[PDB]
Amino acid sequence: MAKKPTALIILDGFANRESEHGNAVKLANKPNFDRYYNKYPTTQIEASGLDVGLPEGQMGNSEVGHMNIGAGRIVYQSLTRINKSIEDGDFFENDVLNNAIAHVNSHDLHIFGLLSDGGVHSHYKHLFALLELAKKQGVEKVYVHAFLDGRDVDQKSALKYIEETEAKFNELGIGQFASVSGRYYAMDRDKRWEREEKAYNAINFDAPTYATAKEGVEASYNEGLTDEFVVPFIVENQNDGVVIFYNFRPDRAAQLSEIFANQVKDLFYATFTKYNDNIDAAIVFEKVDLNNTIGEIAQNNNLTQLRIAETEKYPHVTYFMSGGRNEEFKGERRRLIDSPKVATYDLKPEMSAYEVKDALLEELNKGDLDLIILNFANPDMVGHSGMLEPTIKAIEAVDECLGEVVDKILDMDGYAIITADHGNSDQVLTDDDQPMTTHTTNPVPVIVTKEGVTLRETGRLGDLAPTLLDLLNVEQPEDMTGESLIKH
């Protein structure tokens, strides 16, 4: 039969902020959003930091946000999980780590990794935990092979990390630097194996040599070359030749993992996480499998669903919404609308929002949809320009589309949840009027277009799918630890 639709409408990069200064959200003329906001129940929810599985303080983002929305739970990221296992001790009881330690004592340990607190590919505090573990289980020879960042952190900051780590070597008693390589060598990913080789060699074959890590790095600086581009080198008398790789992101660790792996005998080789490097390694950390995301629950209650967005947020309403899964669920269909081909979207702030809107109206007119997941990309994609007037026009175009969409849903006696996945356009200028081109940490609005209900006064993205299921009168599975924003 024909169905009354329930729609989640994600205004990407659109959050609540008090001041109007650099606040495209407030300066925009958005009569439709404002009409719905004044008429219908509203609240505001957290989309950053620990509430979306990120470290405390970290702005949210589209990938994390769409995964938390779809999952109906906090989806904990790798960095957050590792940090928690250290704070809670699990790390030190880790079988693959205690195995590794036992193996070098029976043959009586190198450590590879990006040495910074960038948190994109690694974190050196995890190195500090490896050391401490080895100091508990009494390891004698620990050699640290350092890859220098300058890319996820300040361009010239390696000396700070090296100094803190040797202090740890001293405050702890074991460990030393055998080799030092800019990530431009040890963490290439564009199949540039001339660069990988220099790093392989430093780790003790033909390669530059210096008396300390500090010395080689300072030599690089004097030659105009910062941390990322540091030519690999050995630390004098400190590298006795040849293992744990504490990077947790595969794409930049794989090529070096393949050179090293692809002649030594009886080598224990572990990676913090499984890389696509084609070799047999012990894996320190296993992923959480996400099941019973909203798409799966819709499918298992025989509901039809639509995922729709233009190119820039199409992965987000498909792969990320479905919990890291490309395959459609049974009953699921999708509409991809091509984004404009421009280098930056301030050149066409309406992007393809009107074509997204028209495609949605086409699908709603079929009358066969239980569940709709729609994203309007514009506030985030234009707000990354740090330009106020383009981002205003982006929000105004979305607001006009939003009115046609929500009015049709309401005329089909359906329901909409209007929200966002994190902030951006709520601050496109700094307080000194410079461009502000990142996401924000601000909480996101929520409108539920059902009269006579009351919403909880706070929440998080993990609560949105429970709310949808509430409106659908569908049972919520245990895997979804979030809670519906509608009070009962």
Binding site: S62, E63, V120, D152, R249, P250, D251, K287, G324
Partner: peptide, 14 residues
């Protein structure tokens, strides 16, 4: 995005 995977900073280095 594509170069990486969901559990390895898909918002960065793209």
């Amino acid at each position: 995005x594509q170069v990486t995977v969901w559990w390895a900073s898909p918002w960065e280095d793209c």
